[PDB]
Amino acid sequence: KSPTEVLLELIAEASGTTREEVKEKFLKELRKGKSPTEVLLELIAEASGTTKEEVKEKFLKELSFGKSPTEVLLELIAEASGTTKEEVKKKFWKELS
């Protein structure tokens, strides 16, 4: 599996929605020209019920602290689902290879 694919699956679970609902949202947005990361942050915002800005800001405070996008996205996902950074990171690597 691919990192993006895995991220969507994790977001789907976080939201409490379908892999297919989320892949479809993903594609909708990507076709308007947005980068996969942007879109992923948007989908995370909806999973967490916060504003897109708010999550974008927050990704950027983290990134700036020296963290990487994948790391941050994984943390952001855990928050959205109300679980452990450590726990989602684990599912991610399990599903990835």
Give the ranges where the chain is alpha helix by DSSP (H).
3-15, 19-30, 36-48, 52-64, 69-81, 85-96
> How buried is residue 37: exposed, middle or buried, by Cβ count under 10 Å (0-12/13-18/19+)?
middle
Contact 27, 93 (CB under 8 A): no
Distance CA 22, CA 25 (A): 5
Domain around 91: 1-97
Q: Would you say 85 and 52 are in contact if contact means Cβ atoms under 8 Å apart?
A: no
Burial of 22 (0-12, 13-18, 19+ CB in 10 A): buried
> Number of folded domains in the chain?
1
What approach was used to elucidate this structure? X-ray
DSSP reduced 3-state for 47:
helix
How many whole angstroms separate alpha carbon 64 and alpha carbon 1?
28
Other C-beta atoms closer than 10 Å to the C-beta of 48 total 20
> This structure's resolution (angstroms)?
2.8
